[PDB]
Each structure stands twice: as C-alpha cells, then as structure tokens.
Design a protein around this ligand. Structure first.
Ligand SMILES: COc1ccc(-c2c(-c3ccnc(NC(C)=O)c3)[nH]c3cccnc23)nc1
Length: 304
C-alpha cells in the first residue's frame, strides 16, 4: 500500500480552511501539516495539489509541499494534502501575539516579497516555471517559520500563465479572494481578467496591506501600534464587496500611515513601498521583484 497518508498520525486540530480541515500530524517521526477534504470537495483538493506540483515551484518562501494522497478509513475516503509544519502558524497569529524589532519587520517583509516574486516569475527552459498569481494574499495565508522569515501558503485559488499564447490555465471567476484585501479594480469589476499581469498587480495591492499590518507591530523605543486588520477603522468585520468598494473605490481611502513611521529609515522605506502598492492604477504599482530589491538593499544596510 501507500507510503504517505497510511503512515501519518493526526495529533491536533489546527482549524478549517476555505474547504478542508487542517491538522498537525506526525510522519516518519517529523511534524507535518495535513489538510483533509471530503470526496465532494475533490475539485478544490485536486486544484491545490495541481498548483503545488508546478515545475520549479519550490522556494524558501513558499510553503513546502510534501504530497497529495487518499486515505480510506473503512467508511469514507479522505483526500489529503501534506506540507511542512510551521509552529508559529500564520503571520496574522504571529502579529497578534508579538511585536517585532526593525530587523524582525524587514525579515518578514523581505521574505514575503521574495516568495511573491518567485510565484510571479516566469522561468524559461525544458524545466520552465509558469508565472503564477495568488488571488488571495493576506496575513492569514502567510506562515512564519522558526527563523523569523515567511512562506506563502493557501495556493488553492492561484492562476497560472502560458506566456507564448498569453492564456491563463483556468477560466477565472470574478472576486474569488478575501473581500477586505481585494484590489480597487477587483472591487469595481474593471479588472481585465484576460490579461495575466492584472492578477499580479492585484496581488501587489494585497501585499501592501500585509506590509502595513507588519509595520504597525514594529516596536522602536517601546513604541508600536496595536494589531489591526487593514480597514479596521472603516468597514465592519466580514465586509461585503459593496462596503469595501465604497471605501476603496469611491471614497478612495487606504490604511492610515502614522506620523511615527517617518522617524526611522526602515519605516520610511516600508511606508513608501505601501503607497506604491496602493495606487488605484495597477500598472503604476511596484513589482514584487522591485520590492525584493529595495528590501534586500535595506537588510544589507541594517546588517540583518
Ligand atoms: C499542502 O498542504 C497544506 C497543509 C496545511 C496548510 C495550511 C496551514 C498550515 C500549514 C503549515 N503549518 C501550519 N501551522 C499552524 C500552527 O497552523 C498550518 N494552515 C492552514 C489554514 C487554512 C488552510 N490551509 C492551511 N496548507 C497546505
């Protein structure tokens, strides 16, 4: 029989995904994360398995995929996905529990941008990698590793591009991600979903929101802000597309950038990156590769 799910023992319930239940399990003596889907969720399981098996996807800042498998308990079949386990869990959880140093903030922002740049990058060759857009980037979908760096997770809603024909591998539905992090063009449905670059640009808007969440938690001289989700000051919990659209598209508001972020170079660099991810016009936003370059130049300066 099989050598994956058969030999894994579930230990602790982690929580529920969009589809699938998440667990901490033990495989060959090591801790692993397991996501379990029912038979009726096969389409969601298969699509996530497909994204994680993309040629050349592996990267230090992308969740490490182990395997897709099935497990029959004698009554029903379970569809499994197995990955590396990260004890800190999400960046959302990490930022709620802790404050970070200037060094800590740059490590989190650089690692996030490096993972997104890798996802977004097309690699030519026999073992080429297609460009991939996430479509649901948020702090709850980024995990924090023991070394204080991030890895991008929740790849189930991703879209992949074929550069030669300029085609996207699936027929994309509108507004699939988390409403709070939807880019202006997604909220007002002006996004041209036939152009792959549109999805990459919408991911950068969401990454800007995540950088704002991190920067709030950066403590200098014991001074920092409390943890908040972006737009906590303007929309209810679980906002609708309409509530977000009125704020982001009509009133044209963005998360507030505090005055204290101008007192420190690292916070001035982060604040400038945010403003340049938040442009209503996606074509004006920075690329993930440009952000990675800016933050790498900053990490080198701070001696991280
Ligand atoms: C390809 O296989 C997987 C397996 C698990 C997850 C996954 C994880 C996950 C991963 C690693 N470590 C942890 N660690 C702590 C402490 O939660 C949690 N959290 C989630 C929440 C919702 C949906 N999926 C997930 N994704 C993909």
């Amino acid at each position: 029989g099989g050598t994956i799910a058969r030999t894994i023992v579930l230990q602790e319930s982690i929580g529920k995904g969009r589809f699938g239940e998440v667990w901490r399990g033990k495989w060959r003596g090591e801790e692993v994360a397991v996501k379990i889907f029912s038979s009726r969720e096969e389409r969601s399981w298969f699509r996530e398995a497909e994204i994680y098996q993309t040629v050349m996807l592996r990267h230090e800042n992308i969740l490490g995929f182990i395997a897709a498998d099935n497990k029959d308990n004698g009554t029903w079949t379970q569809l499994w996905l197995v990955s590396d386990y990260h004890e800190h869990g999400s960046l959302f959880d990490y930022l709620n529990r802790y404050t970070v140093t200037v060094e800590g903030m740059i490590k989190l922002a650089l690692s996030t941008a490096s993972g997104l740049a890798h996802l977004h990058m097309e690699i030519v060759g026999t073992q080429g990698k297609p460009a991939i857009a996430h479509r649901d980037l948020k702090s709850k979908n980024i995990l924090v590793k023991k070394n204080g760096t991030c890895c991008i997770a929740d790849l189930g809603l991703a879209v992949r591009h074929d550069s030669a024909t300029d085609t996207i591998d699936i027929a994309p539905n509108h507004r699939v991600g988390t409403k709070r992090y939807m880019a202006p063009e997604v909220l007002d449905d002006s996004i041209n979903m036939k152009h792959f670059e549109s999805f990459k640009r919408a991911d950068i808007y969401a990454m800007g929101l995540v950088f704002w969440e991190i920067a709030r938690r950066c403590s200098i001289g014991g001074i920092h802000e409390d943890y908040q989700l972006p737009y906590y000051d303007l929309v209810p919990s679980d906002p609708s597309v309409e509530e977000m659209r009125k704020v982001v598209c009509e009133q044209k508001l963005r998360p507030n950038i505090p005055n204290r972020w101008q007192s420190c170079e690292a916070l001035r660099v982060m604040a400038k990156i945010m403003r340049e991810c938040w442009y209503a016009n996606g074509a004006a936003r920075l690329t993930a590769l440009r952000i990675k370059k800016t933050l790498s130049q900053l990490s080198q300066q701070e001696g991280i």
